[model samples]
Structure formats: C-alpha cells, structure tokens
Target: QAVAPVYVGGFLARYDQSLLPRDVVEHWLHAVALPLNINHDDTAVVGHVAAMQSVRDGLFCLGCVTSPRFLEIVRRASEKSELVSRGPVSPLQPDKVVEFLSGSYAGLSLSSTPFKHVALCSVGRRRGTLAVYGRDPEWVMQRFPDLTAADRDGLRAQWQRGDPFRSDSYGLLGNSVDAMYIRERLPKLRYDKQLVGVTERESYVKA
Candidate 1:
C-alpha cells in the first residue's frame, strides 16, 4: 500500500491546536528539519512531531517540578533560537585561541595533555572577539600582547564568573559547532526511499 504524504497541519492538529500556531509550527518544522538535513517526508514529519511533543511535554512538566534535565533542555533551545535569529553563523574561524583552549591543533586532537584550567570570555554574538584564560594569566598575555589594560580587566571579570569552557557555550565554542555540522551534513541526506521523486516530497528520501 502507498502511504500518503505528511501534512504538517493535520499532524499537529491531532496533538494540540494550541501547541503551536499553524504558521509557527510550519516554520519550525522546516527550521529544525532543514538544519538537521531531514527530508520533508512522512518519517521526517513523524520525527519532528515527536520532537515537538517532547518539547511540549518538557515545558508542561517544568511547572510541576525543578528537574535539571528539563531546565537544560529549555535553556539549550533558547540558546539555539537566539543564535539562529542573529542571522547566519559567524565565519570567524577557530584560531590559536580556540585551538589552544580546545586542545586541538588545526582542528585535530593532539595529545591527551589537559590544561590545569580553561575559561572563555566574550561579550556579544557567539563568534565575536574572545579571550581565552588559562591557569597562568601571564601565558595568555605573552601570546596576545595586544590586549589592553581594559581587556585584562574584562578578562579578569569573565574569569571570576567561572564560565568554564565546555561544549555547551553560546557561540563558536559550543552551538556553532553543532550548527556548522548540521549545515555541512544533514540537509543533503535522503528522507525516505519510497517517496523518491515525489514532486510534493519535502523531506529527505533515504535509501
């Protein structure tokens, strides 16, 4: 039997009319799927529907308790939305600062050597100027000697805030990696094999 195309409106209507307005839901369906390179097809629709349900459930459950997991999910979504709204991801390549702090040389992992400590300091968009702080402030100064006294003061302030360099930071150090990966990989894959060549097909046709 031939399965019918997935109508996003009909799918969401089955879940909750107020879950998301038609236009908003449609926008997200494309926004989330295209970035992830998901083809517009039944399976892709189903997957997006499931993810939306999960988000809805998470938001609803948040009013009942204080679950760190749920909070993290919401926070991550908020951050990603903000990044996307800022326009295209920054083209600022990860330079010496990112390489040294991320422990990668030309984006390749070197040794297992670990820094005693690492921190990221930035103000503005994710790919804006950044200051890398390590256990030895002098080491950072020696490398980036152009840093002004004000820059040093700002770095100290950021260091004191204790925002460790992690995979979840706002810009290049975090979500930008995910964004770049998705843009480079996801949007080109097949959504489903059966729906191949279907003119109305909006998702990836998988083999």
Candidate 2:
C-alpha cells in the first residue's frame, strides 16, 4: 500500500576477493549505470545500483525490486539466508560474428563471464512493491508513486510488433510523447545496462 526505500551501498566486491578496497568501485559506480538483476539474469533486471563500494562490508547495492515476485523473495530473506541475492555483470565481448555466433566467447571465452546472486540484502517493505534501500516511502512516492503505471505500459506493449516503447534498466521506457515521463521514471542514478552486442575486436573475420 506504500513505496519503499532505496538501498544505498555497494553491491559488488570490484575485483572480488583481492581485498577489493574502495574508491575504484565507487568511481565506477559513478562512471557506469549499473542495473540490479535477479540470479544474474540480465533480461530479468529488477532495479538500479544506487551505489557500489569496497564490497562494503560484503556486497552492497541499492536496487528497487520492480519485479513484485522477487520482492517476496526479499521479504523472506531472514527466513532463508540468500533468498534475495544480487550482483554485478560484465558486458560480453567477442572477436568476430562467427565468435559471436557461438565460438570463443561462448565456447572459449576470456573467462567464465559469470554474474551474481551470491549476495542477499534485506527489505524494509510495506503493502506495495519495489524494495528500495535508505529512501523513505515519501521520497520514493514522489518519484515512483506506483510502479504499476510504468509496468502497466510494458504489458500494453508486450513486444507489439517491434514497438518503439520498451522499459530498460532505468525502469519504464520513455518516448511515448510524454516528454518528462522518462525523466520522471528515472531514479537518482543508473548505468546503461543495454546489451546490443559489439563489433569484432580483431580481423578474424570469415564467411
């Protein structure tokens, strides 16, 4: 029946295990627009990384769990440790289209290209949805009164014949002639989590 707070802190350990001090992570969090994902599934993005740090005590992040179903998982966190997990993601890269098709990156990647779900944070919730951290319900309401409106738009689209309207990591998508509608949907800060593939790194091209 109400909005939630924004989780303000680090959601990653930067290099993860190398002491992973602070600074760099905070800078990067500022540099990039990071999105909060479920079980590390990019398409299943739920919120934005309001902040990041030296793994702050151990994986810190401020995400608005837009996905209501996942919110329950957060709700039951104490009931079961690691119920609401969160983590960072490194965008994918490859050498060529062939590689991109299913060669090295997938078959023989640089690393494992793994993601997160290893860290779980708690939820200070209400009757409504979206479990933000630190932010009070009033502040949240000012920005996101009811996520349903943003979510509702998505349902209407539902990939309607390649419709221009679509929601991104920043929550609901803009461009519906609403002008500030997109900005209104925007959170304090977010990274560009759009994965549109990439150009070949070297000349290993072929037909």
Candidate 3:
C-alpha cells in the first residue's frame, strides 16, 4: 500500500507581547518551501522571512489589528510615507502577506524536491513574533530523536493552522481554512475519482 502523505497546517498567532527566537521565524520560511521541493537553505530563506516580517509590521501599523485607536494612528502615519504605503488599503494586509510568503515557499519547495506537505507558522508573541512548524510527526521524531514529548506537541500544535471563521481562531478576519482544505483534499483526489467532475456536476446536476 502507498504511504499516506502527511498534510501540514500553519498560521500566525498574535498575543499580548513577548520575545521570540530568531530561528523560530526562519524555520517557518524553510518549512513552507520544503513541500514545494525547495532545498533547505537558511541563508536564502531568512531574507524572505525578514521581508515578510516587514510586511506584517506595515499591516499592523495600517490598522489591520482589532484596536481602532491604534489603527487610526497607524493609518495616519502610513499615509505620510511613500504613496504606496498610504491609502484606504495598504499593500501589507495580513492575508496578502501570508499568501505571498506561502507562495514563495511553495515555489522554492516545488523547484527543488517533492514532499508530502509543508506549511507556514507565524505566532505573535506577547510582544514580537514566534513561529512553529509541523511535518510528519513520526518522521520528525525519528530525525531529531532528542525532542521531549511536550516539546514535540508544542511544535505540532504551533505548526497546525488556525481556523479564521471560528471565534477562537487567531489572526485577522480570514485564515488557513482554505489552505488546509486544499492541502488535505489535493492528495485524496486520485483515490476519490468522484472529485474529478464534482465541480461541473454541481453546476448542472439536479438534487
């Protein structure tokens, strides 16, 4: 029997405030690229991760967060920068930033090698940013061989994507629901051939 391909979920979490490890964010960028077949290169991935961090800063300053007072202040400040930085909508919305980051990771991964799954994990510290990543738990454990169970769970949970529509979900208004669904279902298509025409059938089929 063919092995079941693992699916990874990722997200960015915002907390009150805190400090994070430099490598934490860096690793997430690498994880995102892995499934797409990208070689694991810390030097190359870190730059992209840093760029993402900049975008996140812009989004936060542009009033994307829940606080209206903070938003207004940031919105005003952003307007004073380059024309591209100011507007009704900044180019640095959280969703767009994550999308860009994930896409770049995917491109790198696919270009280099194939994997069962890869994902982006971003967690907002009480102050700064913290990140986690998930791969095949069994595979990872074997590879590391030194992680404590608790540490492993923390990473897996951190790497897991957050649901947006749900009240408890993190991040902005929308989130990884679509990303998770796509990742999970894509591998199942071959086994479930009914998926092939389902979209067309939905448009034409009678109940």
Candidate 4:
C-alpha cells in the first residue's frame, strides 16, 4: 500500500471579542464541536493539542477575550480526539473520522468561520494522507482580510522549510515556552501568558 505524503500547517486566527458578543461564542461552540476519537498515546497529537491551548491562553492573557463558552467548545472537541492512548483499546475509532476532521480542536480554530478560522494546509504529493492541524487551507485563508495575497504566499513558502514539508515546527515545536517568555520580556508587550510548549518530548522527532 502506498502512503500519501503528509503535510502540516498551523492556523493563526484573530478574534474580536466585542464584535462576537457573548451569544456568538455559545452558539458557535454548540454548532461546531463534533463527537470523535483521537489517539492519545500519540505524543505528536498531544503536543498539537497543547500548542492550541497555548495559543488560546496567550490570547486570553493578552486580554483579547475568549468566552468560557468558547473554551468549553474546544474542550469538547479535544476530548473526542482520543489523543491519550495508542493501543487497541484506544479512545479513537475509525468511524469518528468526521469529528476528527471538522470538530473544534484545541490548537485549531473554533469553526469554519471564514477569515477567523486561521488554518494552514499541508499539501501532500499523494492521496490517503491527512493534513495534521487543519484540513482545508484555502477555506481558512479566506477569513483573514488583513492578510494580503502576497502575505499568504509568504506563509506557503515558510511551510516548505523543513523535512520535505513533513515537519511544521521549524525546530520550534517544543520550544514555544522560551519563545513566549522572551516575548514577555519585550517592553510594552501586549500579551503575557505562561507559554506552555509541547508537554511530551517524544512528539518532536526531527525526522
């Protein structure tokens, strides 16, 4: 059997608390979170989830504002991924693929909400491969108005830097902790949160 080439992309969405209103977060959470399973034993999956939380925490600490309802939405979505196990009794099941793909993930955008979703696509040269992080790159790209076409193209260029595009961390996947602290050190820094990097070191295989 041929395995499809795998690509990884990260989503960076900006949310406006004032524009959303409280109800928006609630409604979106209810509508977007799907029931699914993920492999928990997979260190890579765990690390990815942690990164998402970091992004959320960073935004919240910055006082950007994320509703509790939204956080719950992410929690529900993450629970289904089966991210904590690897064996036969693993929490993830094949049937839950839909939830895995479309459901709200910890490090991912809450919904398919056009520009705010902030997703990147890891295009593979073959078929049957899944793009970790988020699936629909183009759909995510549509949400950001401030990002010009050139900027988007620049992101694509950045995606290809490491390991045939198989790795997206840029040697920083497990290094966000230091990055966060350094950002905090900057004068007049906008966001100040304890940045948590990948909890499991095994997730970071340079290959």
Candidate closer to the true structure by lDDT (higher is better), 3 or 4:
4
Candidate 2's TM-score: 0.28
**Candidates' lDDT values, in order?**
0.22, 0.26, 0.24, 0.25
lDDT of 3 by residue, 1-207 (tens): 001222222122222222323444435442332221112322112211211221121111000112233223223433343432322123323222222222222211211122232222221112211111112333322222223465445444433431111121132113334334345333332221132222222111111
lDDT for 121 in candidate 3 is 24
Model 3 TM-score, 2 decimals: 0.20
Candidate that would win on TM-score: 2
- Comparing 1 with 2 on lDDT, the higher-scoring candidate is 2
Please report, as a residue range, the 10-residue window in candidate 2 with the lowest summed lDDT: 104-113
Worst 10 residues of 1 by lDDT: 57-66
Better of 1 and 3 by lDDT: 3
Ranking by lDDT: 2, 4, 3, 1
Instruction: Compute the lDDT for candidate 1.
Output: 0.22
**Per-residue lDDT for 175 in model 1?**
33
Candidate ranking under TM-score, highest first, comes to 2, 4, 3, 1
The whole-model C-alpha lDDT of candidate 4 against the native structure comes to: 0.25
Identify the candidate with maximal lDDT.
2
Give me the displacement of residue 61 in model 4, in angstroms: 19
* TM-scores of the candidates in the order shown: 0.19, 0.28, 0.20, 0.25
Under the 3 Å rule for N, CA and C atoms, how many clashes does model 1 have? 15
